[PDB]
């Protein structure tokens, strides 16, 4: 008898049966999670470490990937042999057409895109205007700590500690501290009309993040010179995007229809040409092959 | 910083142990069952004034997985024990489930809770309440509740009532 843990981005998990090794697929292990065979189609397993995170294909045997993985890092990147064992998550699946999950009503979908769009938010992939970020520490704490009490959230309430829970890491020590009157104002009259159920409010969260251009990407890891900056690329189906890998600041943001790409000689670089101001830019990445055949399909299915 | 608490659900096949475990933390409760080899959820929850991170463990229900049995008791700091109210023979199971505990943990202070579950099926008792209340009273006077996973009867109780313990 075999298992395996799939985790999600909270650091729950679920072990599910290996019924044939490490020769068992993605879409194997997908029927021994607790979906439906409709909520299945929104989600898949990925593998993931510190330095990488790749969405796993139907047909791919998780296991292998995980055994292969020193063999895939020196392929995909440009680092020294690493110590890290990836582990496997379920998460959404990119290729999810954001039409298609602003109609999702299930309780256990809605739950799962939400943590991990908290998870995101938290690790700073979501630049947003700071209202938008004070909208959605607010949930959070709705979420969390249920109704806003003056009693007991007013005063002495939101510290550092319990910040770093409902912000961006990124916003944490620089502005956050000037946030705290206008995120407990925004909790309170969330409290004083609106659905307290628990789904509803998480769905509320996600109708906010849906809107940030990022949402839903998956990101790849490269290199651009003006100095060389090691930068996020992330892929999603709005478009693509760069972000400073040190501070996760925005450098880029562009949507499908207003940019063309070239992958370059071999699978080390890819071009980015605007359609529009006739600026471009080059990102040195071994993942160049993975990042432009995500650009294809995505800018693909429209 | 917030503590946390490993929690573990034990019990027979069939019982509610995920029921009970996913109403808690997910808020759902569907007829619709999936088998469990091991799961592990996460919550933060206030208890006592105090904001706690629960680690809840949802176990097989099976002498299957020893490994995993005997890491349960070794690690577990609090442990909810799961009858069916409709079922005698998972009522009968729990008696070895408390002595192993015992015998792990080497001592009889050990955080627990027996949980009668099911009991919004009335019409289907088998095992009366005032038994699992005679049970509990064998165990040094443990812990004892009848909760639904169905219409949430006591299920919040089940675990905040372990983290008491834990804090003791
Ligand atoms: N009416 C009612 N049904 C319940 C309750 N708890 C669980 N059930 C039902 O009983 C069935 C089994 O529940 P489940 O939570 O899967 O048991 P388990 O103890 O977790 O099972 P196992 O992995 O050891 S085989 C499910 O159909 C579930 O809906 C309850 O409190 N009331
Ligand atoms: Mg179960």
Redesign the interface.
Known sequence: ?E?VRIYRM????????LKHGNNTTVQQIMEGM?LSQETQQYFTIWICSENLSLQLKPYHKPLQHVRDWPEILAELTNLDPQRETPQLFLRRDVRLPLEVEKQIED??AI?ILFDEARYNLLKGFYTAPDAKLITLASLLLQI??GNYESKKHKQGFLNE??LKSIVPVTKLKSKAPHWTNRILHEYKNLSTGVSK???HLQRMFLQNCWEIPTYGAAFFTGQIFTKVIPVYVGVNIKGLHLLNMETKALLISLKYGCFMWQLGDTDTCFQIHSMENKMSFIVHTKQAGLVVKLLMKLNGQL | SMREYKLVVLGSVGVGKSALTVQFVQGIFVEKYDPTIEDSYRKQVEVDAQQCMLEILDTAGTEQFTAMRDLYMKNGQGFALVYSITAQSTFNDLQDLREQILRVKDTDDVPMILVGNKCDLEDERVVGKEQGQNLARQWNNCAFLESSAKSKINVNEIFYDLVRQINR
Request: aromatic fraction near 14%.
């Open positions: 008898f298992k909270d650091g729950s998990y679920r072990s599910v049966e607790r309780p256990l739950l969390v700590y500690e319990n159920e628990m789904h």
